[PDB]
Design an enzyme around this catalytic site. Sequence first.
Site, PDB file in Angstrom:
ATOM      1  N   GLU A 131     -31.051 -42.463  14.579  1.00  0.00           N
ATOM      2  CA  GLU A 131     -31.296 -43.892  14.704  1.00  0.00           C
ATOM      3  C   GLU A 131     -32.327 -44.309  15.740  1.00  0.00           C
ATOM      4  O   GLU A 131     -32.879 -45.361  15.563  1.00  0.00           O
ATOM      5  CB  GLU A 131     -29.970 -44.698  14.988  1.00  0.00           C
ATOM      6  N   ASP A 144     -35.692 -52.386  10.426  1.00  0.00           N
ATOM      7  CA  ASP A 144     -35.324 -51.060  10.034  1.00  0.00           C
ATOM      8  C   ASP A 144     -36.111 -50.576   8.821  1.00  0.00           C
ATOM      9  O   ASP A 144     -37.018 -51.254   8.326  1.00  0.00           O
ATOM     10  CB  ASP A 144     -33.813 -51.019   9.841  1.00  0.00           C
ATOM     11  N   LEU A 159     -27.510 -53.214  12.955  1.00  0.00           N
ATOM     12  CA  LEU A 159     -28.098 -54.182  12.023  1.00  0.00           C
ATOM     13  C   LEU A 159     -27.724 -55.590  12.429  1.00  0.00           C
ATOM     14  O   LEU A 159     -26.611 -55.861  12.763  1.00  0.00           O
ATOM     15  CB  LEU A 159     -27.678 -53.913  10.561  1.00  0.00           C
TER      16      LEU A 159
END
Length: 162
Positions: free
Chosen positions: A11, A20, A32
Amino acid sequence: MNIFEMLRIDEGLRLKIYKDTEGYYTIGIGHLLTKSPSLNAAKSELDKAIGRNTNGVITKDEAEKLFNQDVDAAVRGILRNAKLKPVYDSLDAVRRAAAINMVFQMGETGVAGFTNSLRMLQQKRWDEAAVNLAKSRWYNQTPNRAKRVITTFRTGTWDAYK
Ligand SMILES: [Ar]
Ligand SMILES: [Ar]
Ligand SMILES: [Ar]
Ligand SMILES: [Cl-]
Ligand SMILES: [Cl-]
Protein backbone atom coordinates in the site's frame (compact mmCIF):
# COMPACT_ATOMS: atom_id res chain seq x y z
CA MET A 1 6.96 -10.46 8.45
CA ASN A 2 3.32 -10.06 9.35
CA ILE A 3 0.07 -8.61 8.07
CA PHE A 4 1.02 -5.10 8.91
CA GLU A 5 4.39 -5.11 7.27
CA MET A 6 2.94 -6.90 4.31
CA LEU A 7 0.18 -4.39 3.70
CA ARG A 8 2.61 -1.53 4.43
CA ILE A 9 4.61 -2.84 1.47
CA ASP A 10 1.66 -3.30 -0.89
CA GLU A 11 0.00 0.00 0.00
CA GLY A 12 2.83 2.47 0.71
CA LEU A 13 2.42 5.43 3.01
CA ARG A 14 1.28 8.85 1.80
CA LEU A 15 0.56 11.76 4.17
CA LYS A 16 -1.44 13.85 1.71
CA ILE A 17 -4.75 12.86 0.02
CA TYR A 18 -3.96 10.90 -3.16
CA LYS A 19 -5.80 8.92 -5.68
CA ASP A 20 -5.50 5.20 -5.67
CA THR A 21 -5.12 2.79 -8.59
CA GLU A 22 -8.86 3.16 -9.34
CA GLY A 23 -8.75 7.02 -9.16
CA TYR A 24 -10.37 7.22 -5.63
CA TYR A 25 -9.36 9.59 -2.91
CA THR A 26 -7.26 7.82 -0.30
CA ILE A 27 -4.71 8.71 2.34
CA GLY A 28 -2.21 7.06 4.67
CA ILE A 29 -1.72 3.28 4.25
CA GLY A 30 -4.42 2.61 1.71
CA HIS A 31 -7.21 4.20 3.76
CA LEU A 32 -9.95 4.81 1.11
CA LEU A 33 -11.77 7.91 1.93
CA THR A 34 -14.43 8.11 -0.73
CA LYS A 35 -15.54 6.91 -4.15
CA SER A 36 -16.73 10.44 -4.93
CA PRO A 37 -14.93 12.62 -7.46
CA SER A 38 -15.21 15.51 -5.11
CA LEU A 39 -12.03 16.54 -3.31
CA ASN A 40 -14.13 18.35 -0.81
CA ALA A 41 -16.07 15.37 -0.03
CA ALA A 42 -12.80 13.51 0.46
CA LYS A 43 -11.47 16.21 2.78
CA SER A 44 -14.70 16.08 4.77
CA GLU A 45 -14.51 12.34 5.30
CA LEU A 46 -10.84 12.80 6.22
CA ASP A 47 -11.60 15.32 8.99
CA LYS A 48 -14.40 13.10 10.33
CA ALA A 49 -11.97 10.07 10.33
CA ILE A 50 -9.23 11.99 12.19
CA GLY A 51 -11.23 14.14 14.48
CA ARG A 52 -9.75 17.55 13.43
CA ASN A 53 -9.45 19.96 10.54
CA THR A 54 -6.65 18.36 8.70
CA ASN A 55 -6.76 20.33 5.54
CA GLY A 56 -5.81 17.11 3.63
CA VAL A 57 -2.64 16.35 5.42
CA ILE A 58 -2.16 13.95 8.42
CA THR A 59 0.76 12.83 10.45
CA LYS A 60 2.49 9.43 10.40
CA ASP A 61 0.92 8.49 13.74
CA GLU A 62 -2.57 9.40 12.49
CA ALA A 63 -1.93 7.33 9.33
CA GLU A 64 -0.80 4.32 11.51
CA LYS A 65 -3.85 4.70 13.69
CA LEU A 66 -6.17 4.55 10.68
CA PHE A 67 -4.24 1.54 9.40
CA ASN A 68 -4.64 -0.28 12.66
CA GLN A 69 -8.38 0.33 12.63
CA ASP A 70 -8.55 -0.89 9.01
CA VAL A 71 -6.67 -4.09 9.63
CA ASP A 72 -8.83 -4.79 12.64
CA ALA A 73 -12.04 -4.07 10.72
CA ALA A 74 -10.86 -6.33 7.86
CA VAL A 75 -10.30 -9.33 10.19
CA ARG A 76 -13.58 -8.74 11.93
CA GLY A 77 -15.35 -8.56 8.61
CA ILE A 78 -13.91 -11.92 7.60
CA LEU A 79 -14.97 -13.50 10.92
CA ARG A 80 -18.41 -12.19 10.54
CA ASN A 81 -18.83 -13.43 6.94
CA ALA A 82 -20.37 -16.79 6.67
CA LYS A 83 -18.70 -17.55 3.37
CA LEU A 84 -15.26 -16.37 4.47
CA LYS A 85 -14.92 -17.47 8.01
CA PRO A 86 -14.70 -21.19 7.40
CA VAL A 87 -12.06 -20.68 4.82
CA TYR A 88 -10.00 -18.46 6.90
CA ASP A 89 -10.30 -20.77 9.92
CA SER A 90 -8.95 -23.66 7.88
CA LEU A 91 -5.81 -21.78 6.89
CA ASP A 92 -2.39 -21.54 8.39
CA ALA A 93 -1.17 -18.15 9.66
CA VAL A 94 0.74 -17.04 6.54
CA ARG A 95 -2.18 -17.82 4.25
CA ARG A 96 -4.56 -16.03 6.60
CA ALA A 97 -2.46 -12.86 6.13
CA ALA A 98 -2.95 -13.32 2.40
CA ALA A 99 -6.72 -13.48 2.90
CA ILE A 100 -6.65 -10.37 5.03
CA ASN A 101 -4.71 -8.45 2.34
CA MET A 102 -7.34 -9.25 -0.31
CA VAL A 103 -10.18 -8.19 1.93
CA PHE A 104 -8.35 -5.00 2.82
CA GLN A 105 -7.96 -4.22 -0.83
CA MET A 106 -11.30 -5.14 -2.17
CA GLY A 107 -13.77 -5.67 0.57
CA GLU A 108 -15.45 -8.61 2.08
CA THR A 109 -18.02 -8.61 -0.50
CA GLY A 110 -15.47 -8.62 -3.21
CA VAL A 111 -13.58 -11.51 -1.76
CA ALA A 112 -16.70 -13.48 -0.90
CA GLY A 113 -17.27 -13.57 -4.72
CA PHE A 114 -14.20 -15.78 -5.50
CA THR A 115 -16.30 -18.80 -4.82
CA ASN A 116 -14.33 -21.29 -6.70
CA SER A 117 -10.96 -20.10 -5.34
CA LEU A 118 -12.26 -20.10 -1.82
CA ARG A 119 -13.31 -23.70 -2.13
CA MET A 120 -9.90 -24.70 -3.58
CA LEU A 121 -8.17 -22.90 -0.75
CA GLN A 122 -10.39 -24.62 1.76
CA GLN A 123 -9.46 -27.88 0.18
CA LYS A 124 -5.66 -27.03 0.21
CA ARG A 125 -5.34 -27.35 -3.56
CA TRP A 126 -2.73 -24.57 -3.74
CA ASP A 127 -1.69 -24.65 -7.32
CA GLU A 128 -5.23 -24.84 -8.59
CA ALA A 129 -6.34 -22.04 -6.39
CA ALA A 130 -3.51 -19.93 -7.66
CA VAL A 131 -4.42 -20.44 -11.23
CA ASN A 132 -8.09 -19.66 -10.52
CA LEU A 133 -7.33 -16.59 -8.54
CA ALA A 134 -5.36 -15.11 -11.44
CA LYS A 135 -8.46 -15.34 -13.73
CA SER A 136 -9.80 -12.07 -12.41
CA ARG A 137 -10.02 -8.46 -12.97
CA TRP A 138 -8.06 -8.00 -9.74
CA TYR A 139 -5.07 -9.73 -11.19
CA ASN A 140 -5.27 -7.97 -14.64
CA GLN A 141 -5.51 -4.51 -12.99
CA THR A 142 -2.87 -4.91 -10.24
CA PRO A 143 -0.82 -7.77 -11.40
CA ASN A 144 2.41 -7.23 -9.36
CA ARG A 145 0.52 -7.04 -6.09
CA ALA A 146 -1.88 -9.86 -7.09
CA LYS A 147 1.15 -12.06 -7.88
CA ARG A 148 2.68 -11.47 -4.46
CA VAL A 149 -0.59 -12.40 -2.67
CA ILE A 150 -1.18 -15.37 -4.97
CA THR A 151 2.33 -16.77 -4.35
CA THR A 152 1.71 -16.35 -0.66
CA PHE A 153 -1.46 -18.55 -0.91
CA ARG A 154 0.40 -20.91 -3.14
CA THR A 155 3.42 -21.48 -0.92
CA GLY A 156 2.44 -20.56 2.58
CA THR A 157 5.71 -18.61 2.98
CA TRP A 158 6.65 -14.91 2.75
CA ASP A 159 9.04 -15.30 -0.10
CA ALA A 160 7.24 -12.93 -2.43
CA TYR A 161 7.82 -10.22 0.13
CA LYS A 162 11.48 -10.97 0.90
AR1 LIG B 1 -10.85 -16.17 3.30
AR1 LIG C 1 -9.99 -15.28 0.85
AR1 LIG D 1 -10.06 -16.02 -2.20
CL1 LIG E 1 -12.68 5.91 9.89
CL1 LIG F 1 0.26 -4.15 -8.59
